[PDB]
Amino acid sequence: PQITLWQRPLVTIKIGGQLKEALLATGADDTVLEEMSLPGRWKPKMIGGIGGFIKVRQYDQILIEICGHKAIGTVLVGPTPVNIIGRNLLTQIGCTLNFPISPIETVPVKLKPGMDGPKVKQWPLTEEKIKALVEICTEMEKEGKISKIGPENPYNTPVFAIKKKDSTKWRKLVDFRELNKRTQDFWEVQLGIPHPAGLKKKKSVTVLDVGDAYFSVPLDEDFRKYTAFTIPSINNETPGIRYQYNVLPQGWKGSPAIFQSSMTKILEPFKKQNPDIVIYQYMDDLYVGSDLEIGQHRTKIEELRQHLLRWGLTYELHPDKWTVQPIVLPEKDSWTVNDIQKLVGKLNWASQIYPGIKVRQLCKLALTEVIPLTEEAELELAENREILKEPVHGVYYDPSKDLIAEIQKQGQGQWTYQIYQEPFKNLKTGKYARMHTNDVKQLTEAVQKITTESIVIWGKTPKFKLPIQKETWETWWTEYWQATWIPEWEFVNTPPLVKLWYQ
Amino acid sequence: PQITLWQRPLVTIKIGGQLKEALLATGADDTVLEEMSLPGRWKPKMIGGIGGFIKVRQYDQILIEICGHKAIGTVLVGPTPVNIIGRNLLTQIGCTLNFPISPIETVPVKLKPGMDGPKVKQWPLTEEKIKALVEICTEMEKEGKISKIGPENPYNTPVFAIKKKDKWRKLVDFRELNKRTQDFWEGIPHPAGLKKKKSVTVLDVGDAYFSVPLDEDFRKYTAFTIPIRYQYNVLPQGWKGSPAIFQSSMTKILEPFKKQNPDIVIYQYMDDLYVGSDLEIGQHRTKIEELRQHLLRWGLTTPDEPPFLWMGYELHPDKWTVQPIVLPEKDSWTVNDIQKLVGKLNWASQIYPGIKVRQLCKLLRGTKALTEVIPLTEEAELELAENREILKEPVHGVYYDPSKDLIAEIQKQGQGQWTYQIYQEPFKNLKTGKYARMRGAHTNDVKQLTEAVQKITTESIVIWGKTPKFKLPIQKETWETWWTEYWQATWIPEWEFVNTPPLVKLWYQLEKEPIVGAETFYVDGAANRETKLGKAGYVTNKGRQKVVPLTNTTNQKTELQAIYLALQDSGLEVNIVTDSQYALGIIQAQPDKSESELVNQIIEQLIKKEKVYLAWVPAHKGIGGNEQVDKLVS
Structure with missing residues (x-):
């Protein structure tokens, strides 16, 4: 049974055929009982208490029932005020000290x-x-x-x-x-308000793992x-x-929700003394940003590491260099009838992104030969080209809905992705390239880079629509993943025209 | 933490900077310390111990850290033999006395x-x-x-x-x-995953439940x-x-004996204890006697040979096999026994594939009575009988030696039948299996090979843990081309080709550049709903065409039909412009088997052609082509 210590832990003990009560003692070496007849020879001995030393008779291998449990051990008979169960008989039972916490719950x-x-x-x-x-x-x-x-x-x-x-x-x-x-x-x-919007503008963001804090x-x-x-x-x-x-x-x-208040206490000196640093955290990671020269950015990184380890805790990422890749259109000197057909097929899809697109001149209509373009088609097409090569329009972030990341393969050691919250309206567009190597590694690195950018810019991992059979991913995704987090992914089994469209 | 009382239970105590250790005393009603640094004022107190009494200095509201748990309480300072943590500070912490356990857990x-x-x-x-x-x-x-x-x-x-x-x-x-x-x-322990052990015995627990x-x-x-x-x-x-609690108890009781003997290897599934060792039989019997006595210690009873029957696998000096598994036969079977025979068939499913009892399971699960003689279906019964007839096949295999690498091999029998031969030496199968199509609708042989490799790798990691070196049949040029051109992501671990009379190849290719002189052929399609009144055809550079009425007219069907109509009357080098993304997607996946004889007819047609090039156009737009029969439906 579990005994609270509000009162003395006396338990019924049976000695030499007798019912009695002995106090279980944790700080008592041997076992000392009251004056009674004990079988076998005895040895004179003395024990020190908080008042001095007393003369006791030592009986070895003596039968005792503690709380209805048999124990055989040395028993000392002496002039003791409280019958006592010492660690010697407590060990035979296996009595143990059990510990709970008082300050932290x-x-x-x-x-x-x-x-x-x-x-x-x-x-x-x-x-x-x-x-x-x-x-x-x-x-x-x-x-x-x-x-x-x-x-x-x-x-x-x-x-x-x-x-x-x-x-x-x-x-x-x-x-x-x-x-x-x-x-x-x-x-x-517990919401972290506000999410730092300045990390998006930093010249260098260093990711420091702080998992050990928890x-x-x-x-x-x-x-x-x-x-x-x-x-x-x-x-x-x-x-x-x-x-x-x-x-x-x-x-x-x-x-991190539990550790947020605890940690921000430790960060208080740091945000006190260098405001231009933005320090933002995620499931395991600390992002530290500083729009300084890299020389001293790396300098304050070391000091931050020392500050963190001092109070018991424990490629480069460049948001400025991050850029939005536009969509371009071919301009061959002498195109042929096939080229106009392909170009129109591509462009009519583009209206779902950039509404200000008109092709009625272009579709005005051999395919072994060139067809020189008509002048009004020339001007309209050029106007459309200018419109396409401009920042996307009428788009922003609605924080009420999750984010979707769609990756599409370009098949020559290159990849392209679209990061959108709703169809045909994309937030971030970019390509991933690494020049014959493994293939699953490429998506895994691409997924990781998408999620790092997403954490920095909108602070959450989006839902992926991966271009791979689920069976294939489930086998070799863990071989090449170096990141504490894990993003939600759904699998795509339909090849669209978007892959040809983008690059 | 749980503290045994074998030696004094001292814990670290820190008094305002001072490090030191004190004895956790349950009897010591108060905490008594030999010295406190610069304590200052203290009221006089008298306390009793074994031998007499002693004056002590009482200190109040002392913040002390005992074993990593903070306590603020009165601390006595007196001539104590050892520092004593009293029940007063013990109650500030959560320390409690757990007492003797009974027999087992x-x-x-x-x-x-x-x-x-x-x-x-x-x-x-x-x-x-x-x-x-x-x-x-x-x-x-x-x-x-x-x-x-x-x-x-x-x-x-x-x-x-x-x-x-x-x-x-x-x-x-x-x-x-x-x-x-x-x-x-x-999972279930496969026979293929038993290492060689020169001394082996199998012990059954005497109804250890x-x-x-x-x-x-x-x-x-x-x-x-x-x-x-x-x-x-x-x-x-x-x-x-x-079964779960039985297995857990067996584990907990076996852990010490295993610990004191690292060499031996001990398995246990239901009632068998597969013990194996490389020690000599003269030695191994003595060690197994030690095992039996230790097993009896915890109340388990052990009741009371070139063959060994372990989990239904017959272990043999250098080979393994499955004791032939058969069922009781009767016109009507006892229902509860049927609830047993379903389990036996379930177990045999792992050993031998091609077992389905789903209908038999449903007939049982709906039924909940025994008084009425439970009718049994003839169809599911015949399925059981035919399944059993296949189940008459003796398996084989040999013990895995990790020092030698696995070498698998797949062979293409025909039309969606493959083989799964696995081995580490020639002509000694470790495990043999077969694979067939899963979608059954649209596929291609190279994709089937990739899926078969995936299945083999999964099974191999399950059984032995290390992925094997496949011996695929396909030519390397073909695999590289398909992997570099196909849109999705596929990988195959280290492998080499092996030459067999049957082989896998991509039958045809769709050209990437429209062909000079080739009669470019435009196609279009549409369908209706009230009366399936949609017609198909093609429109050609010279204007030849044919619209032949079609039955069961379906939109995807019509889009497919438009291509075939032109392909039938096309020569070698052809160009086909289609307004269907769906037809283009189905065709350009380079498939080889489909439920459609229409699709298959296209495949057989396109095999004959030498240079075929397909392109796509937007729908409901005028592109200078299909306008000749733009009026087809509206």
Whole structure:
């Protein structure tokens, strides 16, 4: 039973066939009882208390029933005011000291009403990945970070160990996409207002991982059950070690929500002394921006790292150089009938983006020969070309709806993407290029770069419409992903004309 | 944290800068310290200990950090032998005394929310069998297994008597009980994934479910009446919740023995304990004797050879096989046994593919009675029989040696039939399988090869964990062309071609440049709804055309038909301009099999052509072509 310490923990003990009450003592070495007859020979001994030393008779291997549990141990008979159960008999039972926290009590964590914890089965993993994951997870449990569970917890979220940088050390990720979606209500209680709009203008934004901060702020107990994962074993030989997170997770939506007030305390000196720095955070990462020369930007990066580690926490990204790629139209010296047909087929699609497009002259109509363009078609077409080569119009951000990221392949080591909130009206358009290599790596790098830009510019990961079979992605997406977050993706099985349209 | 009392439970204590350690004393009502730095004023106090009494200096509102937990409380300073953390500061923290555990541990189990069952009136039995029920019950109780609850428990579940052969074995129907149990975590170990071990034995646990205790607090939900209410205290012999807790208990009890013996490898699925080691048999029997004694320690009972029967796989000195799996046969089968035979077929599905019992499962699931002789369908029964006839095939294989790489190989039999031969040495199959089309509507052979590789890789990572080196048949030039030109993203791990008389290739290509002199042919299509009154044709550079009335006129069908009409009357080098994105998309995927003989006719036609080039136009626009039959429908 669990005994509160408001009162003395005396328990019924049976000695030499007798019912009596002995006080369980945690600071008592041996066991001292009242004067009574004990079987076998005894040895004269003395014990020190808070008043001096008393003469006691030592009886070894003596039978005692503590709280109805049999114990055989040395028993000391002496002139003691309180019958006492010492650690010597307490160990035989296995009496233990159990500890709770007084100063810090995790803030409650809640779910959207009528929403159960995530139940998403884990996809298979490679042998080296599981071999390293076991090491990482067991080391974590050795430091008290996670505790193993049985079968009473039906929830589960997938896991995969990755390598973020060139450093030869794996780190695990938990796909909390379902848990973040379920616990979306707990974000509404705490909004980060305002999101920094100055990061969009910085000359250099450095991403510093601050995941380790959450390891010191424990979770509200009733929600611990929801964070469970299984590290499966090859060939399903051993069933699979299922743990629960005791400290806060990394990818959980509330993981920074709990730590927001705690951290901003630590950042107060920094924002106090150099306002031109904009420091903004996401699920695991710290973005620090400074529209300075890179020489001292890198200088304050080091000082920020030292400041963070001093209080116990722990390619380059350039928003200015980021540019919006327009759409261009061919202007061959002598086009042929095929070229006008293709150009019209492309252009009539463009009206869904730039409304001020008129082609009625162009469609005015061999295809082995050139057809010189008519003058009124010339002028109208040029006017349209000017219109197309101008910033997009009548578009802005509605923060009430999520964001959609659509990637389309150009098939020569190049990629193009469109970032939109509603169809035919796109926020950001750009290309990704890297010059014969692997193919899945290209989308994964492209997805990561899209999401980094999206985090900087509108501060949330959009929903992807990937150009790959779901079966293909589910196998080799984790091979080449270096990022703590995970974006929501849906799979596309229709080739449109947009791929030919854009580039 | 939990602290054992084997040595004194000292914890770190910090007094305003001062580091030091104090002894957590449950008996020491007050916290007593040898010294405090610069404490200043203190009221005199008298405290008693074992031997006499002592004057002490009392300090109030002291903020002290004990073992990482803050406490603000009175701290005494006196001539104590050791620093003493009293119950006064212990209650500021949460420290409590846990006392001796009993025998074993019980995994906590709870019901699904918002449920207060179960309750089903047991259809009263008769005395001849009731005698058997009583006889079982008395001995079961004296074994400390099932206890006669108090009549205050209000629930009941049925019990039947079964001969256990095809004599009145006990069974309790937990069909309604399973509907309220909380969910629990529930693959299969393939024979292909057993490493060679020169000494092998398989031990069966002597009904070990009768050794792992069930929740004493959950026992209220598994009563047992004989029409004398009883109650299970260990795992039910048929509860679907039992396997999980049984496996968990087996793991927890095996962990120490495994720990003290890293060399041995121990598996356990249902009742078998596959123990293997490379030690000599003379040594291995002694080590297995150690294993059995340790198993008995925790209350488990162990009952009481070139073949070995492990999980239905027959282990052999250098090979493995599956004991032929067959079913009982009768005109009508016992319903509960049918609930067993579905499980046996389910298990055989992993060993041997081509097993579907979904209809048989539905016929059972809808039915919930035993009094009426349950009718069985002839169609699903014949499906079962034909499935069994295929199930007459002895599998084989050999043990995996990780020192040698896997080498797979796929071969194209025909029209959507493939092979999955896997091996590490020639002519020693590790596992053999077959693959067929999944969509069944539109596909191509190269895409099928890629999908087959994907399936093989998934299965291989499941079984052994390392992806293999495929030996595909396709030519490398063809694979590179298709992967560089196809719109989607596909990868194949390291592989080499292997030359076989059948091979995979892309039959045809669609040209990327319109062809000089080729009779460019314009096509168009439309359809109606009230009477399917839409017609098709083509319009040509010279103006030849034909509109032939069509039945079951459908818009996508018409768009397809427009191309074929022209392709039939076209020579070698052709250009086709179509106003359908859909027809263009279907054609240009370079498919080879489709449910449409119209699509297949186009494929066979286009095979003959030498230079075919397709382009697209916007609809409902005048582009100087189809205007000749723009008036087709309106």
